[PDB]
């Protein structure tokens, strides 16, 4: 759908490559700066799957992407300070593959605290072991493999979805004068929801 | 003083009251507090083998 998007795995992205690669030219002999995948998908979203098969040097070089949305790499006395408003569409993977009910919720993932602190929203796929879950999802697979190009019953085609993408960036909404009192009263609710025990707990807000 | 003969009804009800699950009918006369407790340790038994 969105043309401003990339696709890579864990081992396919080393330390650089997607941010800003630097290598001496062969027909000029001078340290140049090569853009990565985060600079070409400006004002879009980058995709990445399997967040386990990777080292620790690549996560440090991308910490300035979800908090500052900029690239500041000065390597070899060559200044290369750019910026990119690309969102990170990460996809964490459990250690043992499945969510272990015996271990804690922080022992099944490999993400630490500085990584999750700079990241925004964090969702978890709901896992249900009921007889109604597999009974409803199996009906959609049968209707898709038997009725080819006939199971889609959308009310708006894909031609009008891309048209409504430019109207959102026209009239910038404002903030009403009756909403400043509603935000200051909802943050204190999540402040107590964070400290389940005494002070700290799991997700820091 | 109102049963002149016998039938197949007076013998079936006398065999059920002496064969019901005596370990499952004691939870009907409870509130919600102790009912949620016995289910709490049931969930802990699945993770603590």
UniProtKB/Swiss-Prot annotation, chain A:
Entry superkingdom: Eukaryota
Signal sequence region: none
Record domain MCM: where: 1-142
Chain positions recorded as ATP binding sites: 93
Modifications after synthesis and translation: O-glycosylated (O-GlcNAcylated), in a cell cycle-dependent manner.
Localization annotation: Nucleus; Chromosome
Family: Belongs to the MCM family.
Additional comment: Early fractionation of eukaryotic MCM proteins yielded a variety of dimeric, trimeric and tetrameric complexes with unclear biological significance. Specifically a MCM467 subcomplex is shown to have in vitro helicase activity which is inhibited by the MCM2 subunit. The MCM2-7 hexamer is the proposed physiological active complex.
Function: Acts as a component of the MCM2-7 complex (MCM complex) which is the replicative helicase essential for 'once per cell cycle' DNA replication initiation and elongation in eukaryotic cells. Core component of CDC45-MCM-GINS (CMG) helicase, the molecular machine that unwinds template DNA during replication, and around which the replisome is built.
Name of the molecule in the record: DNA replication licensing factor MCM6
Curated annotation (Swiss-Prot), chain B:
Coiled coil (residue ranges): none
Locations listed in the record: Nucleus
Subunit (UniProt): Component of ORC, a complex composed of at least 6 subunits: ORC1, ORC2, ORC3, ORC4, ORC5 and ORC6. ORC is regulated in a cell-cycle dependent manner. It is sequentially assembled at the exit from anaphase of mitosis and disassembled as cells enter S phase. Interacts with DBF4. Interacts with POLQ.
Function of the molecule: Component of the origin recognition complex (ORC) that binds origins of replication. DNA-binding is ATP-dependent. The specific DNA sequences that define origins of replication have not been identified yet. ORC is required to assemble the pre-replication complex necessary to initiate DNA replication. Binds histone H3 and H4 trimethylation marks H3K9me3, H3K27me3 and H4K20me3.
Sequence similarity: Belongs to the ORC4 family.
Connected disease: Meier-Gorlin syndrome 2: A syndrome characterized by bilateral microtia, aplasia/hypoplasia of the patellae, and severe intrauterine and postnatal growth retardation with short stature and poor weight gain. Additional clinical findings include anomalies of cranial sutures, microcephaly, apparently low-set and simple ears, microstomia, full lips, highly arched or cleft palate, micrognathia, genitourinary tract anomalies, and various skeletal anomalies.
Protein name: Origin recognition complex subunit 4
Species of origin: Homo sapiens (Human)
